[PDB]
């Protein structure tokens, strides 16, 4: 809601370097759980957990069962985390500033 905690429960999912790639790869196309262990060299059951703590937290989310997916409505942040990381980006790059060498 508004006291929420769950904004954390992403940013800590996301800080693994692994739930990410995850994360990027569901985004583009895959839901095999196998494929995502063998571009990795992982135990399935390892991304199964990897997965399973993205989607707890709320980034994720088995619909129709067995390949999945992603979730329901709250969220945002995203929100804020988006304008957030695009000021951060877009000054963060501004000041390429470079008047004479």
């Given at each position: 809601d508004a006291d929420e905690d769950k904004a954390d429960a992403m940013f800590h999912a996301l800080s693994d370097r692994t739930?990410?790639?995850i994360l990027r790869r569901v985004l583009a196309g895959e839901h095999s759980v196998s494929t995502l262990a063998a571009n990795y060299d992982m135990s399935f059951a390892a991304v199964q957990k990897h997965v399973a703590v993205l989607?707890?937290?709320?980034?994720?989310?088995?619909?129709?069962?067995?390949?999945?997916?992603?979730?329901?409505?709250?969220?945002?942040?995203?929100?804020?985390?988006?304008?957030?990381?695009?000021?951060?980006?877009?000054?963060?790059?501004?000041?390429?500033a470079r008047i004479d060498e």
């Open positions: 739930r990410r790639d989607e707890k937290a709320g980034l994720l989310t088995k619909r129709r069962n067995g390949r999945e997916q992603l979730a329901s409505g709250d969220v945002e942040a995203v929100r804020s985390v988006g304008a957030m990381l695009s000021e951060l980006e877009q000054l963060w790059r501004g000041r390429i």
